[PDB]
């Protein structure tokens, strides 16, 4: 009686390193710190200095100019409500193609 053990692991999984783009897309504006942290896996934050900004970074522009990325910055007002999200691509806006040559 041979034990036929052939399990399939999915090479399509991201278990750490960086946050997935679709994962950050789970949350929304007006979503409270608790739910944002619940969904994104964010640690508890309650800065008494007034710095209510959450910093995240995912891959969307891996390489082309070397300096090309969008900074995902969350801004929630003291009630815990995401009031503004900072999300703009590195294609002229939050950042552009590095150095105006030609």
UniProtKB/Swiss-Prot annotation:
It is found in: Cell outer membrane. Keywords: Cell outer membrane, Lipoprotein, Membrane, Palmitate, Signal. Coiled coil: none annotated. A lipid is attached at residue 1 (N-palmitoyl cysteine). GO terms for biological process: Gram-negative-bacterium-type cell outer membrane assembly; protein insertion into membrane; response to antibiotic. It is a lipid-anchor. GO terms for cellular component: Bam protein complex; membrane. Disruption phenotype: Mutants show minor defects in the assembly of outer membrane proteins. Part of the outer membrane protein assembly complex (Bam), which is involved in assembly and insertion of beta-barrel proteins into the outer membrane. Nonessential member of the complex that stabilizes the interaction between the essential proteins BamA and BamD. May modulate the conformation of BamA, likely through interactions with BamD. Efficient substrate folding and insertion into the outer membrane requires all 5 subunits. This is Outer membrane protein assembly factor BamE. It comes from Escherichia coli (strain K12). The gene is bamE.
